[PDB]
């Protein structure tokens, strides 16, 4: 417990709180700096105040400001709220803030929020599609399975090397029809995942066999429209790709749609005939 007192203030790294070139010469640095300067100035000005001559009132008054400063970087708002000069009456994001809440830092880790091999478009029913598969735009597939395709290009005569294969696709007017054959081949038995707007249950995400199609829309099977609460008035679903042979394994063995027919909630199925089918089978 003798450490609860601060006589040494750790400074956060330089790049983390970015000193960057904005526009025309504008410079943006993380708020933490403003708070750090505060502390630094206070402490220095104190040392000098003690060394100059120390009139009681002024030494305390400063140590006071000092104290508050030290609070500033740690936690802002627990006692008063520091502000950047006349521009934004905003609380300088203190260490505490950075760590707590909704879009904080403890939340950025926990929820890990941005996948490298991701995609998202509008969904559209695909009536002939089987639970096993889903309709994924080829155009979308191309970017999604780019690396997987680059190699495949070299295994065939479409391209000499990777970098070659890259430039070959940098423009849309340059794609030989041979490339689609390559991609169609690359995705042979791989599967991708689909995500719905609010991911409420485990079925909120499912794995399907991509069947490359033309256009912008993504063809989703009708029976799974019940798992993901999704109609087709424009709902959009995201899509991910399992990179390791392991990830793909689990994804097509335990996360695929067709294998998760019953709901974890109830022993009831979630692949029951919906609004349209029942009407047909009734009549």
């Amino acid at each position: 417990p003798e450490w609860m007192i601060l006589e040494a203030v750790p400074v956060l790294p330089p790049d983390l709180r970015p000193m960057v070139q904005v526009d025309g010469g504008r410079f943006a640095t993380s708020d933490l700096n403003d708070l750090y300067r505060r502390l630094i100035n206070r402490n220095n000005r104190l040392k000098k105040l003690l060394a100059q001559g120390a009139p009681e009132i002024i030494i305390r008054n400063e140590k006071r400001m000092l104290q508050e400063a030290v609070d500033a970087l740690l936690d802002n708002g627990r006692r008063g709220a520091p502000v950047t000069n006349p521009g934004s009456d905003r609380p300088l994001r203190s260490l505490t803030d950075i760590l707590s809440g909704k879009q904080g830092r403890f939340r950025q880790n926990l929820l890990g929020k941005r996948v490298d091999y991701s995609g998202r478009s509008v969904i559209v029913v695909g009536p002939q599609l089987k639970l096993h598969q889903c309709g994924l735009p080829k155009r979308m597939a191309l970017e999604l399975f780019k690396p997987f395709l680059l190699k495949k290009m070299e295994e065939k005569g479409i391209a000499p090397n990777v970098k070659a294969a890259r430039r070959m696709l940098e423009r849309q007017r340059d794609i030989k029809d041979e490339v689609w054959d390559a991609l169609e081949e690359v995705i042979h038995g791989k599967v991708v995942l689909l995500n719905r707007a609010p991911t409420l249950h485990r079925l909120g995400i499912q794995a399907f066999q991509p069947v490359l199609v033309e256009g912008q829309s993504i063809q989703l099977h009708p029976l799974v429209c019940e798992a993901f609460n999704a109609d087709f008035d424009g709902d959009q679903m995201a899509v991910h790709v399992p990179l390791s042979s392991f990830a793909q394994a689990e994804a097509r063995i335990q996360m695929l749609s067709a294998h998760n027919l019953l709901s974890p909630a109830s022993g009831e199925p979630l692949a029951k005939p919906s609004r349209d089918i029942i009407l047909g089978l009734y009549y």
């Binding site: 096993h132 081949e185 038995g189 394994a249 689990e250 335990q254 067709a258």
Partner: protein, 95 residues
């Protein structure tokens, strides 16, 4: 759906174990050479631009096709962790 997933499910003690197996199998299928298979002859894996899947399309699609048969063996500790990769490299050539 997929080939006899039920059959496969029943072959293991825990769902999530089957996945492990299939995955590890698909792993060694590629690494030590893709011909490290136990059922290639008469009826085997196949794609249709040609009948070219016989060589290297999907790894685990084979694994399951194998496990569905009764040739492979999956234990909690069947063969000493390091000596397996050694004996495997010695007997399977393709690199």
């Amino acid at each position: 759906a997929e080939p006899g997933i039920d059959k496969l499910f029943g072959m293991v003690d825990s769902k999530y174990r089957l996945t492990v197996v299939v995955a590890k199998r698909a792993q060694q299928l590629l690494r030590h050479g893709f011909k490290n298979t136990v059922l290639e002859p008469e009826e085997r894996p196949k794609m249709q631009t040609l009948e070219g899947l016989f060589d290297d399309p999907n790894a685990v699609t084979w694994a399951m096709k194998e496990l569905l048969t009764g040739r492979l063996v999956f234990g909690e500790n069947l063969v000493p962790e390091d000596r397996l990769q050694k004996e495997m490299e010695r007997l399977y050539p393709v690199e």
